[PDB]
Homo-oligomer: A and B are copies of this chain.
Amino acid sequence: SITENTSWNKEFSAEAVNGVFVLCKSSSKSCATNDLARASKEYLPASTFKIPNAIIGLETGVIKNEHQVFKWDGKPRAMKQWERDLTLRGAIQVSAVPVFQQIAREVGEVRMQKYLKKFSYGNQNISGGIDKFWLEGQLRISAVNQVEFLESLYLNKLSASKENQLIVKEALVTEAAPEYLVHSKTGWGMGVTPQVGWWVGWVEKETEVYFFAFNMDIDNESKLPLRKSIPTKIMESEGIIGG
């Protein structure tokens, strides 16, 4: 149920990219990858962890509803993009880590641990501090596991209410056309070596659905756009993205 698509490393060679793409039609029982070994290798989730963190935040009541506004207290934040009040969708889409760090502290270790067990989320290792484990701690997850987790979310089959799964799904829409709809989330983990870049999500086109996860080593910061463009080119070539 996972096959190595040699037809794909051609897209990684031009930019000298060490990375993996996993692409599954309908279910995680029909996947292909450019690299079987790397597909199952676990990497720091970085900002992709905002997807389970948001679901857990809602399930525990730490996050009130999709209308909650996370107010900026005026204190300097690492990125200018974070120095403003944010909705839940805004916090996710601009990757506002201080909002999610506060959410993780309020969830707490015991509940965080349990929910990552219920979600089968990577190595389920939350060592390194309740507000740091997905940034520079021990949590690790593979591209295959990402696509299993997102398929569950799409189907409302995670161990969470359908309502809370639906709230997080709308928060992840990144491209909307009358032809197709994309839900997705990037990551850049600078707290590990090599640094890791992610783009994960799913595409609904016509009456089909494709789940994907991409990660790569980030050799330098100017390579960051490849985390979306390489998988985008692959999916465009297969007809998955595009009208």
Contact = CB atoms under 8 A, between A and B. Distances in A.
Interface of A: 66-67, 69, 84-87, 89-90, 93-94, 155-156, 162-163, 166-167, 169-170, 173-179, 181, 204, 206-207
Nearest to A92: B178
A86 B94 CA distance: 32
B206 A89 contact: no
18 contacts: A67-B155, A69-B207, A85-B206, A85-B207, A87-B179, A87-B206, A90-B178, A90-B179, A90-B207, A94-B179, A162-B163, A163-B166, A166-B167, A166-B170, A170-B173, A173-B173, A173-B176, A173-B181
A94 B178 CA distance: 6
Given A94-B178, A166-B167, A179-B93, A87 B207 contact: yes
Contacts of A94: 178-179
* Oligomer copy total: 2
Contacts of A173: 170, 173, 176, 181
B89 A204 contact: yes
Contacts of A206: 84-85, 87, 90
A145 to B, nearest CB: 23
Given A163-B166, A166-B163, A87 B204 contact: yes
A155 B84 CA distance: 23
A207 to B, nearest CB: 5
Given A166-B167, A166-B170, A173-B173, 15 more contacts: A66-B156, A67-B155, A85-B206, A86-B179, A86-B207, A89-B204, A90-B179, A93-B178, A93-B179, A163-B163, A166-B166, A170-B170, A173-B176, A174-B176, A175-B176
A150 to B, nearest CB: 15
A234 to B, nearest CB: 22
